């Protein structure tokens, strides 16, 4: 197969961080078998955003991961019907986010319906003060917990002033079709970068590379 070597990506995100409402559109392309995707984002409502764009970026699809023969590829096996994921982001100073994405496919295009909710960021903290620089590359640990494919990673935002701001991610992943078989435990190495932006991060180009491995 359903998945082509070059696929298009359409996205809308709605959400709310610390009471601030926003709507963000994405248009992108990627190479599912190479583990590569990029996306052009445009803030449609609520700009300029009063918080660090970086908290959002991992919400803007593990289909775009290079999987070896010897690990079951749950994501590419979910198409054409698709899959959903739910994520919690627990930051070290008490900020919490819940994000979800329902992913479908029509022809050569993935469609993404994303919701992003955050609360409890301190007003003087690096998120609300816009002090973040980038996510460090990391490794997602994939396993099965009570029948549900689960990915954990301890993430780190580099801040100005050479300190890191830590976040624990937990994602659950669910195929829409009954009986897509679950994989065994494995790892996914990943890196996400902002390639370019304008002044207030109303237009942003994003890139991710991800590779599955067994350790």
Residue numbers in the entry: 2 to 61, 65 to 219
Quote what the paper states about this structure.
The mGeos series of rsFP’s display similar switching behavior to Dronpa. The series was developed from mEos2, with mutations that remove the undesirable irreversible green-to-red photo conversation, increase fluorescence brightness and provide high thermal stability of the off-state. Skylan-NS represents a further improvement, with reduced per cycle bleaching and higher photoswitching quantum yield in the on→off than Dronpa. We present high resolution room temperature SFX structures of Skylan-NS in both ‘on’ and meta-stable ‘off’ state collected using two different XFELs, the SPring-8 Angstrom Compact free electron Laser (SACLA), Japan and the Linear Coherent Light Source (LCLS), USA.
The higher resolution datasets, both collected for the off-state after saturating green illumination and were readily phased by molecular replacement with 10.02 and 9.27 sigma solutions. The two off-state datasets go to higher resolution, but mainly due to the higher photon energy and short detector distances used during these beam times. The R-factor for the on- and off-state experiments using the droplet methods (green) (but at different photon energy) is considerably higher than the two off-state measurements conducted at different facilities, including the lower resolution reflections. Considering that optical measurements also showed negligible bleaching with full conversion, the off-state crystal structures are found to represent the pure photoisomerisation product and not a mixture of photo products. In this off-state the chromophore phenol ring has been repositioned to include an indirect hydrogen bonding via an ordered water to the carboxylate of glutamate-144. The Arg-66 side chain also displays a translation/extension motion where the direct hydrogen bonding between the guanidinium group and the oxygen of the chromophores’ imidazolic base can been disrupted and Arg-66 has been pulled “below” the chromophore by it binding to Glu-144 and the newly displaced His-194, resulting in a total movement of 2.6 Å towards His-194.
